[PDB]
UniProtKB/Swiss-Prot annotation, chains A, B:
Keywords, ordered alphabetically: Acetylation, Aromatic hydrocarbons catabolism, Cytoplasm, Detoxification, Hydrolase, Lipid metabolism, Lipoprotein, Magnesium, Metal-binding, Multifunctional enzyme, Peroxisome, Phosphoprotein
Induction: By compounds that cause peroxisome proliferation such as clofibrate, tiadenol and fenofibrate.
Gene name of the encoded protein: EPHX2
Subunit structure, as described in the record: Homodimer.
Top-rank lineage group of the source organism: Eukaryota
Species: Homo sapiens (Human)
Molecular function per GO: 10-hydroxy-9-(phosphonooxy)octadecanoate phosphatase activity; epoxide hydrolase activity; lipid phosphatase activity; lysophosphatidic acid phosphatase activity; magnesium ion binding; phosphatase activity; protein homodimerization activity; toxic substance binding
Modified residues (N6-succinyllysine): 193, 227
Purpose: Bifunctional enzyme. The C-terminal domain has epoxide hydrolase activity and acts on epoxides (alkene oxides, oxiranes) and arene oxides. Plays a role in xenobiotic metabolism by degrading potentially toxic epoxides. Also determines steady-state levels of physiological mediators. Bifunctional enzyme. The N-terminal domain has lipid phosphatase activity, with the highest activity towards threo-9,10-phosphonooxy-hydroxy-octadecanoic acid, followed by erythro-9,10-phosphonooxy-hydroxy-octadecanoic acid, 12-phosphonooxy-octadec-9Z-enoic acid and 12-phosphonooxy-octadec-9E-enoic acid. Has phosphatase activity toward lyso-glycerophospholipids with also some lower activity toward lysolipids of sphingolipid and isoprenoid phosphates.
Modified-residue entries (Phosphoserine), positions: 142
Name under which the protein is recorded: Bifunctional epoxide hydrolase 2
Record entry for activity regulation: Inhibited by 1-(1-acetylpiperidin-4-yl)-3-(4-(trifl uoromethoxy)phenyl)urea (TPAU), 1-cyclohexyl-3-dodecylurea (CDU), 12-(3-adamantan-1-yl-ureido)-dodecanoic acid (AUDA), 1-((3S, 5S, 7S)-adamantan-1-yl)-3-(5-(2-(2-ethoxyethoxy) ethoxy)pentyl)urea (AEPU), N-adamantyl-N[']-cyclohexyl urea (ACU), 4-(((1S, 4S)-4-(3-((3S, 5S, 7S)-adamantan-1-yl) ureido)cyclohexyl)oxy)benzoic acid (c-AUCB), 4-(((1R, 4R)-4-(3-((3S, 5S, 7S)-adamantan-1-yl)ureido)cyclohexyl)oxy)benzoic acid (t-AUCB), 4-(((1R, 4R)-4-(3-(4(trifluoromethoxy)phenyl)ureido)cyclohexyl)oxy)benzoic acid (t-TAUCB) and to a lesser extent by 8-(3-((3S, 5S, 7S)-adamantan-1-yl)ureido) octanoic acid (AUOA).
Domain AB hydrolase-1: 31-303
Cofactors, names only: Mg(2+)
Similarity annotation: Belongs to the AB hydrolase superfamily. Epoxide hydrolase family.
Amino acid sequence: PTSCNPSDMSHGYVTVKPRVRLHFVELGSGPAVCLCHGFPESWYSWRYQIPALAQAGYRVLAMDMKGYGESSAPPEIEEYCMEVLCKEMVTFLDKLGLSQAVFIGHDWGGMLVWYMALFYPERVRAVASLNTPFIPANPNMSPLESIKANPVFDYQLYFQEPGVAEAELEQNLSRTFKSLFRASDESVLSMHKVCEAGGLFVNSPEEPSLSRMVTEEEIQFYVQQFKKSGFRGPLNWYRNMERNWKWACKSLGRKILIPALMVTAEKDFVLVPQMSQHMEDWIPHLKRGHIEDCGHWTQMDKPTEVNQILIKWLDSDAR
Amino acid sequence: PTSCNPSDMSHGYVTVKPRVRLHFVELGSGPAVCLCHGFPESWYSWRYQIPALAQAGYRVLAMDMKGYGESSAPPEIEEYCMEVLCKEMVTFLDKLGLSQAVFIGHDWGGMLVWYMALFYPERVRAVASLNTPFIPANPNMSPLESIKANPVFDYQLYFQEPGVAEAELEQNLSRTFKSLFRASDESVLSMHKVCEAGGLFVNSPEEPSLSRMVTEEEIQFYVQQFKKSGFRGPLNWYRNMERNWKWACKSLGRKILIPALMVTAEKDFVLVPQMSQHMEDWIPHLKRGHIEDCGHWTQMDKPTEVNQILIKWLDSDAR
Ligand SMILES: CC(C)(C)N1CCO[C@H](COc2ccc(NC(=O)NC3CCCCC3)cc2)C1
Ligand SMILES: CC(C)(C)N1CCO[C@H](COc2ccc(NC(=O)NC3CCCCC3)cc2)C1
Ligand SMILES: [Mg+2]
Ligand SMILES: [Mg+2]
């Protein structure tokens, strides 16, 4: 599938708060489709989708989320709570003069677009998430224990204390992204042993091989992007669990009434498909997609399957 | 009519040549409408149109033309010939992934969009010009004498030699724009006596009053923009008459077959309406608008009339 060369895109910049501007890349004409990447990624994680969606008749806006790339990265941890991130994305639409947009997200971006669907349905034409389920907030369970209930989320505790994960992730950025951006059968890390081993990579190769999913050039683009602001901003998306919990609780009782799509990846061992199994009860018009042989990095593991799923859904439920 | 605050726009940047990027502001959703300002102006000359068109259902892209504002201003005079300017605007569309756009232009921007219609009709959904007629190139008359045939174009000779006009226009930028941006009944200069008086302003007030059309704040925005790159780039649009002549001649014999709109201003004493009187013969589907009591600065003299004319035409002949 056709990918993207970064210097041949149109780059757009929108100021949403005094010291916060969002960067995005824009390709195509038609209904506005806003792509929202996950951790720790980039607008460029959508490189295989951007030209495909544009060619299918859509105006694509691929975000550098707050903390990433060319977008502003405010220093405060609480600027990356889900509530401020959504309200900024509404201002984004406001300043662009868009009444609504289709929202498609992956990982933390997928969490974001569900909350945009839940609290700002008037502004979301339709919503799709890759891997990330929508699970109503449990007003009786704190976020801390719901992590301790599943050892797979052990790495999110390691991510909590500022500066600890930043040092590991920034010590060798090429090692970082070659160790992360891998297919499930190629993985070189266990999210289980992280807080017991003292880090994500301490048992991983120092000179990791290059995944079949990516080139050295594509790795070096991510590396370039993260020299700009580092990992604090991105990691901060994990450091608002209790804030995000309380805000999510303020919604309870309402369904998402807009067209929706949940895409599951069969070998995402963290965002496993079954975590999504009763979303229909909260999202009446939910349609599904599922990708076999697909790990966590959905857009680059299986670009063609993603493109097909998205375009079929956009043409039937977004126009 | 609703105007624009510059810090609350979405700003877009597209690289079209190695050292040339075009800046534009983008508001709204719908068919792409590209606004192209004249001399010596800015995307901000369209401030009264941008929100009105967006509200009517159009995606507005208001350009900072090459040499202006936040767009690149290459040093070479021949980079501002009409041929390079159009081909760059095609690349603009290419890099944005737009198959076509409606093009609307004023003064030199209006000249540009006619040539985009003439040589790139496949890329122009529809075309409109304010004040600037389309007059087929006369392959038997050089541009120099066709100026000497009408003393009104005397100032274009004064504009020819690099550095001469730049010094006058840059010596007091507030004086420059308050002396230029005026209604016809308020004008303080004669384009007739310029090469005989030795300049545009030498007989004009040193502290000119402020036109009823503009505020001090709006003057200061233009002033800010022109501190960036000065007047050489903009003036260079006038310094390619023979190049533009030869290229225009290479078209002769073809009509503009796409939907078109010519808007005349009754008190534009340079781009007078009669200069447009036989465009129908070269442009079969041409529709007209005409604004009484309107000087050269069409968008800010008579914003409401402009908006009405444009939106009615866009809705009937552009969709
Ligand atoms: C119960 C649930 C689901 C709500 N939990 C527990 C409590 O809080 C978190 C908050 O929600 C999210 C949402 C997305 C992610 N994505 C992620 O971690 N991607 C990793 C990138 C690096 C390699 C491994 C994968 C993480 C957390 C989730
Ligand atoms: C015959 C014709 C029409 C082709 N001529 C003669 C030969 O070449 C020029 C080239 O075409 C253009 C096109 C637009 C402009 N606009 C302009 O001058 N605006 C001024 C701003 C400052 C105050 C006064 C008005 C000028 C020249 C025109
Ligand atoms: Mg159920
Ligand atoms: Mg005739």
